[PDB]
Amino acid sequence: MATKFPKFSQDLAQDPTTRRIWYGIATAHDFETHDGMTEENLYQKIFASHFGHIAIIFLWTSGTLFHVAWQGNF
Amino acid sequence: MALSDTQILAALVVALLPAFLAFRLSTELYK
Amino acid sequence: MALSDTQILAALVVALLPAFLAFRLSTELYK
Amino acid sequence: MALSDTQILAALVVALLPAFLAFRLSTELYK
Amino acid sequence: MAESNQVVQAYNGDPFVGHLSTPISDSAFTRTFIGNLPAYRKGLSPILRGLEVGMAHGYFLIGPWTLLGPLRDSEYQYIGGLIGALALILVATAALSSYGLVTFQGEQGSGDTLQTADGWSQFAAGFFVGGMGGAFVAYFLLENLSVVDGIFRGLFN
Amino acid sequence: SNQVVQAYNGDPFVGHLSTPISDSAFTRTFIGNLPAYRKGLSPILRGLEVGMAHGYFLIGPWTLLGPLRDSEYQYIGGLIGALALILVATAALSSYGLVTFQGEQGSGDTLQTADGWSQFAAGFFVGGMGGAFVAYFLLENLSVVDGIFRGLFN
Amino acid sequence: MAESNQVVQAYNGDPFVGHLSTPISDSAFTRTFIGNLPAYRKGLSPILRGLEVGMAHGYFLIGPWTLLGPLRDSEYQYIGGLIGALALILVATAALSSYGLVTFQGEQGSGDTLQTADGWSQFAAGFFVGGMGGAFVAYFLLENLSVVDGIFRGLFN
Amino acid sequence: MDGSYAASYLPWILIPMVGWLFPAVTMGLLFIHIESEGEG
Amino acid sequence: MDGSYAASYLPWILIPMVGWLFPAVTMGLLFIHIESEGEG
Amino acid sequence: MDGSYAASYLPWILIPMVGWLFPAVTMGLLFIHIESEG
Numbered sequence: 013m014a015t016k017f018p019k020f021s022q023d024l025a026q027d028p029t030t031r032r033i034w035y036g037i038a039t040a041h042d043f044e045t046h047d048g049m050t051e052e053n054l055y056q057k058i059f060a061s062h063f064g065h066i067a068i069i070f071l072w073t074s075g076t077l078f079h080v081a082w083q084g085n086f
Numbered sequence: 087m088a089l090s091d092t093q094i095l096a097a098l099v100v101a102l103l104p105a106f107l108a109f110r111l112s113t114e115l116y117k
Numbered sequence: 118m119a120l121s122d123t124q125i126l127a128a129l130v131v132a133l134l135p136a137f138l139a140f141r142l143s144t145e146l147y148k
Numbered sequence: 149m150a151l152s153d154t155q156i157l158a159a160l161v162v163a164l165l166p167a168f169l170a171f172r173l174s175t176e177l178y179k
Numbered sequence: 180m181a182e183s184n185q186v187v188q189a190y191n192g193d194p195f196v197g198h199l200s201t202p203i204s205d206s207a208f209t210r211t212f213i214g215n216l217p218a219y220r221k222g223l224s225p226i227l228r229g230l231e232v233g234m235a236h237g238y239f240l241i242g243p244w245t246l247l248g249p250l251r252d253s254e255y256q257y258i259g260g261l262i263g264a265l266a267l268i269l270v271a272t273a274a275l276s277s278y279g280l281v282t283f284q285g286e287q288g289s290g291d292t293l294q295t296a297d298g299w300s301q302f303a304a305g306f307f308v309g310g311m312g313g314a315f316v317a318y319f320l321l322e323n324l325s326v327v328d329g330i331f332r333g334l335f336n
Numbered sequence: 337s338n339q340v341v342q343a344y345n346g347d348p349f350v351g352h353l354s355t356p357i358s359d360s361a362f363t364r365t366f367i368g369n370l371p372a373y374r375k376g377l378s379p380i381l382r383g384l385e386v387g388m389a390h391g392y393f394l395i396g397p398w399t400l401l402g403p404l405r406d407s408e409y410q411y412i413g414g415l416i417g418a419l420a421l422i423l424v425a426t427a428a429l430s431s432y433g434l435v436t437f438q439g440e441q442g443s444g445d446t447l448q449t450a451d452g453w454s455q456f457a458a459g460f461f462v463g464g465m466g467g468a469f470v471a472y473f474l475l476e477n478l479s480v481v482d483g484i485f486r487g488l489f490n
Numbered sequence: 491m492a493e494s495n496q497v498v499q500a501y502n503g504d505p506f507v508g509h510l511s512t513p514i515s516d517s518a519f520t521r522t523f524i525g526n527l528p529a530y531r532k533g534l535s536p537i538l539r540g541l542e543v544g545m546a547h548g549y550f551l552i553g554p555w556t557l558l559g560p561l562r563d564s565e566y567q568y569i570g571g572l573i574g575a576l577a578l579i580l581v582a583t584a585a586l587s588s589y590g591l592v593t594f595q596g597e598q599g600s601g602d603t604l605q606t607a608d609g610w611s612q613f614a615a616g617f618f619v620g621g622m623g624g625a626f627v628a629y630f631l632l633e634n635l636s637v638v639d640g641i642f643r644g645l646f647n
Numbered sequence: 648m649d650g651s652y653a654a655s656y657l658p659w660i661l662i663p664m665v666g667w668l669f670p671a672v673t674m675g676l677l678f679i680h681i682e683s684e685g686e687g
Numbered sequence: 688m689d690g691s692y693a694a695s696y697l698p699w700i701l702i703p704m705v706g707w708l709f710p711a712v713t714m715g716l717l718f719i720h721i722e723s724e725g726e727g
Numbered sequence: 728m729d730g731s732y733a734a735s736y737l738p739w740i741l742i743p744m745v746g747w748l749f750p751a752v753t754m755g756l757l758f759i760h761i762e763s764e765g
């Protein structure tokens with residue numbers, strides 16, 4: 013049997029308690045411990061995560077600019 | 087000036103694009 | 118003189134008879 | 149003097165005791 | 180052809196069953212008409228049967244009190260009819276449910292999904308919802324009878 | 337046998353006790369005949385009755401204590417609060433059934449299935465909306481109910 | 491062979507089935523979206539699906555006549571929209587039920603509960619109730635638009 | 648729309664009955680009939 | 688129907704409870720009880 | 728609540744959506760995903 017989430021940890025997916033939920037959130041970014049992680053896939057996933065983070069910073073900055081323009085008194 | 091009424095609801099369509107691309111990036115990173 | 122409400126309603130009751138007979142003839146012609 | 153609003157309400161509350169006792173007596177006599 | 184011009188026969192071909200095949204009891208029209216009412220219509224779930232029966236009954240039950248009740252000559256005529264019909268449909272639902280509770284205590288049959296505890300309860304649920312809905316929509320149409328009149332006469336275009 | 341507390345269902349090693357509150361004739365008969373446990377009922381009827389009762393009584397709190405209680409829209413506000421809480425409760429019931437009955441279906445009782453729980457949710461939704469609306473309609477028209485109860489229209 | 495950058499592949503791995511797997515016909519989003527609509531959402535009984543579909547449809551069917559029907563320029567604009575929507579939902583319920591009556595005469599399949607006589611009648615019942623309720627609740631919102639605005643603006647604090 | 652003839656309340660409900668109810672019911676009956684797959 | 692006596696709101700609801708609710712509920716309980724096919 | 732800024736009707740419906748609809752939908756989807764397969 014398996015409860016699917018989290019897909020990256022059968023030791024957690026087979027936890028029949030609420031811990032499975034909590035730890036699933038706590039170990040998602042620790043890519044090194046995902047089941048069957050390789051160094052190359054580790055680096056590539058980190059690369060894409062960096063891209064997403066840069067997009068997030070740009071979106072937050074755009075939010076600052078847009079809200080100042082729209083609802084400000086600049 | 088003040089931002090145009092039509093102008094505020096024009097940035098949201100442009101925001102639909104990073105929304106789509108973030109959805110794609112999330113679904114691809116889940117793999 | 119003008120027709121009465123009673124005359125109009127009495128004709129509908131009378132027309133109930135051709136209705137039933139037309140139903141009977143129809144369903145028999147279906148046989 | 150007239151009877152009080154509170155005396156009427158206190159009467160029903162007190163009557164709750166014989167209601168419960170009558171329930172018990174009836175259900176016991178059913179045995 | 181032959182000699183049987185006779186319109187009455189033994190019911191279902193058994194003359195010793197206490198019933199007769201007559202134009203009212205067992206003509207093609209009555210078989211098709213009774214057999215397609217919500218109570219008997221083939222394949223229906225009891226919920227839909229109850230819903231349809233309740234719609235018809237709740238709709239028509241508003242009338243008697245609406246035109247003849249004690250509030251008929253007051254400012255709350257249609258509300259009076261609605262209250263009466265709603266209370267009546269509530270009591271009817273309680274009657275239907277008590278019936279289901281008492282008649283299906285034992286083993287459940289198999290041929291008739293309406294003639295079971297689950298089926299009769301579904302029928303009661305559908306009947307409650309349909310009766311309340313039909314009563315309230317009849318009340319709503321009556322309470323706005325002027326707009327229905329103007330609609331039917333074209334007094335708005 | 338003067339003791340009124342005994343083992344549950346004749347098993348002293350099951351985590352329960354048989355007490356006047358947990359396992360008496362009145363509790364058995366009352367709880368066992370609530371719409372949740374009444375024998376033979378279909379899930380949609382259980383749900384309908386439960387929803388009727390709950391939507392009915394959920395009108396009161398916001399009616400008398402909500403923010404619009406001091407406005408010209410008191411009853412409408414209580415109605416809206418009740419309807420929204422019932423909508424969230426219905427979404428909760430549906431989601432519970434969605435996650436608890438994923439695989440094979442037990443044969444015990446119709447309520448404890450995917451189809452049965454969704455039917456109970458439909459019944460609850462319909463009954464709760466209806467009961468909330470009828471409570472609001474009675475409160476909004478409390479004057480005609482008063483004239484009806486006092487015989488003012490005779 | 492380092493060539494499968496193509497997004498339009500054979501539908502369900504069968505290139506000889508009259509369909510193509512495209513970002514609209516068979517992509518992850520469209521699949522998880524349409525598949526979790528009330529019509530296809532797994533773990534749902536037919537009456538709940540009908541209830542949800544009817545709620546949505548009856549809710550949005552208020553608008554057209556409300557803003558564009560003949561009663562739009564009367565003092566019964568919202569009532570006229572409501573009446574039109576209720577009649578439309580009644581006709582649609584009749585159509586749904588007739589379809590179910592005709593398509594499921596024969597042997598009841600065992601695939602999905604919606605594709606049976608009982609299941610389709612339950613779906614029609616749910617649709618009727620949900621649609622009437624959705625139309626009435628959108629009508630009630632429009633008629634009490636001032637209280638909705640005061641609520642969402644905190645005007646009553 | 649009105650009428651000064653006798654019993655002018657009759658078109659009021661007969662026109663909807665002839666235009667809406669009669670066609671709906673007869674088309675529904677004929678529909679269930681022509682689709683009926685009872686053998687024969 | 689009015690009442691100058693104290694707590695005259697009591698008959699307002701007590702009359703429907705004694706006349707409608709109590710009779711309906713008790714008759715329902717007795718109907719169920721006298722039709723129960725338990726053992727004997 | 729009001730707003731002299733343009734499109735002041737947008738927060739009117741957008742605050743409930745960000746506060747009610749969006750959270751309910753995301754939490755329901757994540758709840759179904761947490762409790763999937765079995």
Ligand code: CLA
Nearest residue numbers: 269270272273276277369370384385388389711712715716
């Ligand atoms: C405190 C528990 C409780 C509550 C909140 C309700 C609430 C409700 N019941 Mg239920 N009922 C209960 C216990 C309860 N019931 C039990 C234990 C039984 C088994 C005997 C029943 C059997 C019963 C039936 C057969 C039906 C209801 C129905 C209803 C709804 C109609 C309103 C009503 O009856 O007035 C409020 C009732 C009370 C304040 C008293 C509740 C306790 C008594 C014992 C209920 C007795 C039921 C009675 C025979 C039916 C009343 C007739 C009606 C004209 C009021 C309502 C929401 C009707 C419905 O629409 O269901 C979908 C209906 O058909 N009840």
Ligand code: CLA
Nearest residue numbers: 266269270393396397399400471474475478703704707708
């Ligand atoms: C935050 C807590 C809270 C608050 C503030 C309220 C507030 C309120 N409740 Mg509620 N209630 C609560 C919790 C709360 N409740 C809880 C926890 C329960 C138990 C689950 C109830 C159950 C309850 C019931 C059963 C009723 C209320 C009612 C009311 C309203 C009565 C005030 C009134 O209208 O006066 C004046 C008095 C009246 C309007 C009485 C109404 C007349 C009744 C309906 C006649 C019915 C009797 C008759 C026999 C019916 C059978 C007919 C049948 C044969 C067809 C009020 C707004 C009543 C209501 O909603 O009124 C419609 C009511 O019926 N409450």
Ligand code: CLA
Nearest residue numbers: 420423550553554556557558628631632638743744747748
């Ligand atoms: C010619 C076609 C046509 C026409 C004329 C209309 C006309 C109308 N539509 Mg409709 N619509 C159409 C087609 C059409 N529509 C189609 C094809 C769709 C897609 C299926 C929709 C779907 C749609 C929706 C979803 C809604 C409308 C609404 C409206 C009304 C909005 C104008 C108004 O009264 O302001 C006022 C507008 C509002 C007050 C918006 C309602 C705000 C509520 C409170 C939602 C709040 C959001 C949040 C999630 C709260 C949920 C609480 C929950 C958590 C418990 C209007 C009369 C709205 C309506 O019916 O008014 C109630 C509305 O909700 N339309």
Ligand code: CLA
Nearest residue numbers: 125127128129130131132135656657658659661662664665
């Ligand atoms: C075939 C002859 C005929 C024709 C073509 C019409 C035509 C019309 N009638 Mg009239 N009617 C007729 C006979 C006829 N009538 C007779 C004999 C009576 C007395 C019983 C009436 C009593 C009647 C009333 C009270 C009203 C009308 C009205 C109307 C108008 C609206 C349709 C309607 O509501 O009818 C409804 C018809 C009936 C309730 C009675 C049935 C009519 C006859 C008996 C049946 C005809 C069957 C026909 C021959 C079958 C062949 C069909 C063919 C295509 C195969 C319409 C222009 C309405 C009107 O005046 O509009 C302003 C109105 O309210 N009719």
Ligand code: CLA
Nearest residue numbers: 156158159160161163696697698699701702703704705706
């Ligand atoms: C056998 C005694 C008795 C009798 C015949 C009556 C008679 C009457 N009472 Mg009253 N009542 C009584 C005792 C009695 N009362 C007592 C002791 C109290 C104080 C708790 C009250 C408090 C009371 C109130 C508040 C009201 C009435 C009212 C009424 C009238 C309508 C009934 C009703 O709706 O109220 C229901 C009665 C009660 C809720 C109280 C319970 C009655 C006693 C305590 C129990 C009697 C049980 C009885 C002996 C069992 C016999 C069974 C037998 C057939 C086998 C009615 C004429 C109404 C009225 O004012 O009329 C306009 C009204 O609103 N009574």
Ligand code: CLA
Nearest residue numbers: 068071072074075076078097098101737738739741742745
């Ligand atoms: C991270 C950037 C950011 C932040 C923190 C905010 C903050 C806020 N906005 Mg704003 N907004 C933004 C960007 C942002 N905005 C952009 C770029 C636009 C133009 C497309 C808008 C247009 C917008 C409108 C029309 C309104 C707000 C409103 C609001 C307020 C309530 C949220 C809401 O209802 O609208 C929801 C926001 C949107 C629909 C726009 C999408 C936001 C960007 C494009 C995506 C952000 C993603 C980012 C990674 C965050 C993800 C979460 C994180 C954990 C990863 C809130 C204080 C309301 C307000 O005025 O309050 C009074 C309102 O009316 N925003």
Ligand SMILES: CCCCCCCCCCCCCCCC(=O)OC[C@H](COP(=O)(O)OC[C@@H](O)CO)OC(=O)CCCCCCCCCCCCCCC
Nearest residue numbers: 105106109521522523524525526532753756757759760763
């Ligand atoms: C432009 C962006 C495009 C996205 C759509 C936007 C609105 C449309 C919403 C429709 C959703 C479809 C719902 C059905 C989708 C659905 O039910 O799928 C199905 C699945 C459970 O259902 P089953 O597995 O049984 O169904 C499988 C098959 O039936 C598929 O059809 O649910 C999930 O997969 C979990 C959901 C993912 C959870 C996502 C995590 C989100 C949390 C993070 C959010 C970040 C927010 C940041 C910004 C603030």
Ligand SMILES: CC1=C(/C=C/C(C)=C/C=C/C(C)=C/C=C/C=C(C)/C=C/C=C(C)/C=C/C2=C(C)CCCC2(C)C)C(C)(C)CCC1
Nearest residue numbers: 234235236238239308309312313314315316619622623626
């Ligand atoms: C003529 C004739 C006859 C008779 C008939 C009769 C006697 C009948 C009546 C009829 C009726 C009696 C009808 C009806 C109708 C109804 C309806 C159509 C309904 C409804 C309802 C609704 C629509 C509702 C809705 C709702 C709901 C459900 C919920 C929410 C609320 C509301 C309201 C929205 C016969 C064939 C036998 C023979 C020959 C001749």
Ligand SMILES: CC1=C(/C=C/C(C)=C\C=C\C(C)=C\C=C\C=C(C)\C=C\C=C(C)\C=C\C2=C(C)CCCC2(C)C)C(C)(C)CCC1
Nearest residue numbers: 308311312315388389390392393462463465466467469470
């Ligand atoms: C005394 C007592 C008790 C208690 C109780 C309680 C706590 C309560 C209950 C109460 C309640 C809680 C009640 C209720 C009621 C409800 C109702 C009666 C409902 C309804 C509904 C209707 C009437 C309808 C509606 C509708 C629909 C659904 C459709 C359309 C719309 C309309 C609105 C029409 C007990 C037994 C435990 C114990 C002993 C003593």
Ligand SMILES: CC1=C(/C=C/C(C)=C\C=C\C(C)=C\C=C\C=C(C)\C=C\C=C(C)\C=C\C2=C(C)CCCC2(C)C)C(C)(C)CCC1
Nearest residue numbers: 462465466469545546547549550619620622623624626627
């Ligand atoms: C999402 C989305 C979309 C869109 C869509 C649209 C455009 C629309 C929809 C909308 C809608 C369509 C909405 C709705 C609403 C509804 C409602 C909200 C309902 C309701 C109901 C209720 C609340 C209840 C009622 C009742 C009953 C039933 C019982 C008794 C009586 C009464 C009335 C109480 C698309 C696909 C593009 C893409 C993706 C995303």
Ligand SMILES: [Ca+2]
Nearest residue numbers: 335336560561
């Ligand atoms: Ca016009």
Ligand SMILES: [Ca+2]
Nearest residue numbers: 403406646647
């Ligand atoms: Ca306030």
Ligand SMILES: [Ca+2]
Nearest residue numbers: 249250489490
């Ligand atoms: Ca009078």
